[PDB]
Amino acid sequence: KKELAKEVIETAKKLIEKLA
Amino acid sequence: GSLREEIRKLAEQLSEKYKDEEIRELAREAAELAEESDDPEVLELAYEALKKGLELEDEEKVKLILLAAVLAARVARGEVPEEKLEIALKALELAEASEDERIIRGALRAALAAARTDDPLALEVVLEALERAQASEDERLIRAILAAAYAFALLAVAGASAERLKEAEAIVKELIAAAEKGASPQELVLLVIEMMVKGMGVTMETHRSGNEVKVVIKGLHESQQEVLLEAVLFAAELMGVRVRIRFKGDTVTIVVRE
Numbered sequence: 360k361k362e363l364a365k366e367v368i369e370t371a372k373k374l375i376e377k378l379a
Numbered sequence: 380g381s382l383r384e385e386i387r388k389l390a391e392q393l394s395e396k397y398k399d400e401e402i403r404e405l406a407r408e409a410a411e412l413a414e415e416s417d418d419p420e421v422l423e424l425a426y427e428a429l430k431k432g433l434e435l436e437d438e439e440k441v442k443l444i445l446l447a448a449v450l451a452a453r454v455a456r457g458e459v460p461e462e463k464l465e466i467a468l469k470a471l472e473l474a475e476a477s478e479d480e481r482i483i484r485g486a487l488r489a490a491l492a493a494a495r496t497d498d499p500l501a502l503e504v505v506l507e508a509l510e511r512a513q514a515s516e517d518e519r520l521i522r523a524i525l526a527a528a529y530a531f532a533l534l535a536v537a538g539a540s541a542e543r544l545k546e547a548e549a550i551v552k553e554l555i556a557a558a559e560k561g562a563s564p565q566e567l568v569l570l571v572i573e574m575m576v577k578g579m580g581v582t583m584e585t586h587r588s589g590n591e592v593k594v595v596i597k598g599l600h601e602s603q604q605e606v607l608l609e610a611v612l613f614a615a616e617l618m619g620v621r622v623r624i625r626f627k628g629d630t631v632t633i634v635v636r637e
Contacts, residue, residue: 363464364455368420370471371451372427375444377475378483379431 382422386413389429399438405445406432412452421452443480446487447471453494462502466490469509473525479518481617485525486512488613492532501535504528504548511555523558523567526614527551530571534578537606543578550574564618565592565635571614572596572633575607596631604631 390410394403406429413425428448432441453459454467470490474483486509493505508528512521531551535544554570569585572594576583581598599607608624611633615622621636 360458360461360464363461363468364418365420367451367464367467367471368418368424368455370468370475371447372424374447374471374475374483375424375428375431378440378444378447379435 382419382426383414386410386422386425386429389426389433393429393432393441396433397438397441399442402432402438402442402445405442405449408449409445409452412449412456416452416456418455421455424448424451439480443483443487446484446491447474450487450491450494453491459494460499460502462499462506463494466493466502466506466509469506469513473509473512473521477518477521479522482518482521482525485522485529485613485617489525489529489532492529492536496532496535498535498541498544500541500544500548501532504544504551505532508551508555520558522617523564524555526567526571526617527554527574529613530574530610531578533606533610534575537579537603539578539580543580547574547578550577564620565637567618568611568615568620568622568635569594572611572635575610579603579607590637592635592637594633594635596633597629599629599631601629607631 387410390406393406409425409429413422425448428444431444435441450467454463467490470486473486477483493502505528508524512524515521531547534547550570550573554567558567576596581596584595586593623634625632
């Protein structure tokens with residue numbers, strides 16, 4: 360779960376940078 | 380520390396900049412979820428998203444940025460079912476990989492709505508739908524799947540019973556199978572309408588005067604109409620179909636344009 364949560368946060372940051 | 384102060388400041392600033400109630404709600408939710416978590420990584424995520432919302436002027440991009448941040452913060456705060464994490468991850472991967480803004484917004488909206496529910500039945504249906512979309516390289520089919528998943532997830536957060544979600548699951552599977560075989564976008568939009576009608580426990584009549592199908596929906600409370608509209612209008616945009624929606628007293632009429 361901890362590994363999935365870190366991957367979710369990492370992917371969300373990449374998406375936000377793309378959207379910006 | 381300094382991030383916590385800035386997150387609260389930015390959320391208030393975002394609420395002054397943008398009049399749209401959804402940005403104001405998501406900005407407030409990001410601040411709340413960031414505080415409820417003790418993860419620094421969630422704090423930097425919320426800070427980064429709120430800051431970009433202030434640097435940008437396009438409401439649409441800002442909405443999507445806040446949707447991503449709230450989704451991630453909701454599933455990373457505390458300990459959630461593994462299915463919720465997998466839903467968020469696969470939606471975020473679908474959004475990051477696509478150039479079509481409709482897929483980004485469909486993935487985020489379906490996953491955040493699923494993240495709000497606690498029913499394991501609802502989580503497995505949304506996850507299974509996102510698994511199918513990730514396996515496909517057809518962005519047209521992906522948009523059909525996301526339209527079905529978002530409609531279903533909206534039924535779940537609108538309080539549909541487990542029994543009505545089991546019937547809605549069947550329609551989700553029917554819609555995906557039909558889309559894979561090449562059904563018209565109009566046929567798929569009718570399936571979303573049927574899903575919402577049965578899921579909200581109301582009734583409908585279908586009339587095919589000529590080339591254009593008309594659905595008449597009866598029995599919805601006025602404040603329940605918004606759920607059906609959001610599901611149908613969103614599905615119609617995702618699958619490239621125009622609908623005309625007219626209202627009487629308790630009656631909603633939807634013409635699916637061909």
